[PDB]
Amino acid sequence: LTECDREPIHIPGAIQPHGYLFVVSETDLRIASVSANVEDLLRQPPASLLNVPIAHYLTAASAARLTHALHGGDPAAINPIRLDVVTPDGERAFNGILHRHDSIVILELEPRYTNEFFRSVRVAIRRLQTAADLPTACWIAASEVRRITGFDRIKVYQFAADWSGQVIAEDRDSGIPSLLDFHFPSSDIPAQSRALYTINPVRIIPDIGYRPSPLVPDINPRLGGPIDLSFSVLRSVSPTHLEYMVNMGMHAAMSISIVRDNRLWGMISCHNLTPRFVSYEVRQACELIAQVLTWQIGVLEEAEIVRHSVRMRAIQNRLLHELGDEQGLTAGLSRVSEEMLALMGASGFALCSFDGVAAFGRTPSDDEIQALASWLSHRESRGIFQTQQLSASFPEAEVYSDIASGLLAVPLGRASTTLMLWFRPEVAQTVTWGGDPHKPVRLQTRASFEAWREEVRDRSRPWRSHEIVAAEEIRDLVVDVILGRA
């Protein structure tokens, strides 16, 4: 497990030959380190070229652009820089991808779009923005990716709390295999890969079986440690993970992080049969989709709540009056119980006092919710508690599996414990993974990615964010009436 976490993926001393790197002390822009693969391009030796002014390499026009872009700077949205390299053959040019990190400066060379193009992306974005829900937004995101990257398969993979994931949307060309609901374990994106991706959000491997060029030399020329190659686009990628890809059987891979409030939310993973490369530009457009999709994630969240303000208004009104006039509160509840229970996805709900309990629907008896309450107190919040699987973190609960696998708990008090608990019952479901996910490898890639299935119990259906808000708006009501009457 944690052995997977421990590799340095950021320092390999190597790259991907579909491009050419350089490191520079900037003052006159002297090549402080360069990559092996350079020789096929200028036909000269390798360490010879160290401490050499880059500029005589660059057509006049080009060289000047480089220098400016460095302090060009506004707003470090200088990439890509169109360069032309002076050479033995004659006129041939590049896209240049420059960055600074750890007091050294890196420049990478990569291969070189119209009014028709922007429009393609504009409409990508429109569709995404007008998506009705999250599953649908993800799909639009997958295909618009697919459409503009020409890849055989796009997946939107979203992390679960445990850093296991699930492919929640896919789009593939006719005659390409599918991973469309598959889960995969945390081993698959180790804690370090993950954390790198949270700040470097796009990466590509245009041929998964590349010829790794190393660096002449591999040292930081101004701080003298290992070269930290994190924000290099050409940074050669862990061999571990590499065979992994011939295993899936895809001869190219790209992926764009989905980052949401600085926590990685998921990835767009992209697979093609033949090797394939697409220009920086397209990856940029991809990242801009990925971005929009991230933003949408929340607007869909706000929207889902609104869609449901209506029962809510109505129910408030009823609930209000129906509790309003009766000579008991506890009574007043019973009457609206069902529509409420129905509003929440729920089979039952309790109110546990220090001094008793009021139970409604499918719940555990009076004795044991007070047990449940007692337990709730310790948790490292006095805010809402929620889960689909109670017994995961409360093994005393495996018994209510049948009727409370899922619990929503809302305190009335600002930090008081007199609570409203909503229960939901088990719902068995079947999840499919890569292979025996109890056998994910530490060592190399596991052999197989064919569907493997597993029967989960003691778990309720997920709590939707908006049902939570209604719990709250409901506590808000019982709170008021509870107050109004002393």
Cα–Cα distance for residue pair 80/109, rounded to 1 Å: 10
Smallest distance, ligand BLA to C-beta of residue 237, A: 3
167 binds, among ligand BLA, its own copies, none (CB under 5 to 8 A by kind): ligand BLA
Q: Which of 8, 51, 53, 64 binds its own copies (CB under 8 A)?
A: 64
Question: Between residues 201 and 462, which has the closer beta carbon with respect to ligand BLA?
Answer: 201
Smallest distance, its own copies to C-beta of residue 89, A: 25
Question: Between residues 241 and 475, which has the closer beta carbon with respect to ligand BLA?
Answer: 241
Distances (CA, A) of 83 to 30, 34, 36, 257: 17, 17, 20, 28
Residue identified by tokens 């990242």 is: 287
Is residue 420 close enough to count as binding its own copies by CB under 8 A?
A: no
118 binds, among ligand BLA, its own copies, none (CB under 5 to 8 A by kind): its own copies
Q: What are phi and psi of 427, to 5 degrees?
A: -145, 115
Smallest distance, its own copies to C-beta of residue 86, A: 17
189 binds, among its own copies, ligand BLA, none (CB under 5 to 8 A by kind): ligand BLA
309 binds, among ligand BLA, its own copies, none (CB under 5 to 8 A by kind): its own copies
Cα–Cα distance for residue pair 388/4, rounded to 1 Å: 29
Q: Which of 10, 308, 335, 382 binds its own copies (CB under 8 A)?
A: 308
Q: In terms of Cα–Cα distance, which of 475, 462, 240, 452 is closest to 340?
A: 475
Asked if the bond preceding 437 is cis, omega within 30° of 0, the reply is: no
Report the run of H or E that residue 124 belongs to, with start and end.
Answer: helix 115-129
Q: Which of residues 288-307 bind its own copies (CB under 8 A)?
A: 288, 292, 295, 299, 303, 306-307
Is residue 471 close enough to count as binding its own copies by CB under 8 A?
A: no
Kindly report the number of other CB atoms within 10 A of residue 311's CB atom: 14
Name the residue type at position 154: I
59 binds, among ligand BLA, its own copies, none (CB under 5 to 8 A by kind): none
Count of residues that bind its own copies according to CB under 8 A = 54
Asked if 337 and 360 count as a contact pair (C-beta separation under 8 A), the reply is yes
Q: In terms of Cα–Cα distance, which of 422, 407, 424 is closest to 475?
A: 422
Q: In the chain, what are the helix, strand and coil shares in percent, each to the nearest 5? A: 40, 25, 40
Question: Between residues 24 and 233, which has the closer beta carbon with respect to ligand BLA?
Answer: 233
Question: Between residues 204 and 376, which has the closer beta carbon with respect to ligand BLA?
Answer: 204
* Structure-token pair, residue 419: 């609570």
Question: Between residues 38 and 169, which has the closer beta carbon with respect to ligand BLA?
Answer: 169
Question: Between residues 189 and 264, which has the closer beta carbon with respect to ligand BLA?
Answer: 189
Binding to its own copies by CB under 8 A, coded x per residue (else -) over 106-125, reads -------x----x--xx--x
Cα–Cα distance for residue pair 117/461, rounded to 1 Å: 42
Smallest distance, its own copies to C-beta of residue 202, A: 14
Q: What is the 3-state secondary structure (H, E, C) of 383-430?
A: CCEEECCHHHHCHHHHHHHHCCCEEEEEECCCCCCCEEEEEECCCCEE
Nearest-10 Cα torsion for 47, 53, 55, 57: -20
According to DSSP, the residues that pair with 216 across neighbouring strands are 34
317 binds, among its own copies, ligand BLA, none (CB under 5 to 8 A by kind): its own copies
417 Cβ partners below 8 Å, 6+ apart?
Answer: 354, 373, 376, 377, 382, 411
Question: Between residues 364 and 434, which has the closer beta carbon with respect to ligand BLA?
Answer: 434
- Contact positions vs its own copies (CB under 8 A): 61, 64-65, 68-69, 71-75, 77-82, 113, 118, 121-122, 125-126, 129-132, 281, 284-285, 288, 292, 295, 299, 303, 306-311, 313-314, 316-317, 320-321, 324-325, 476-477, 479-481, 484
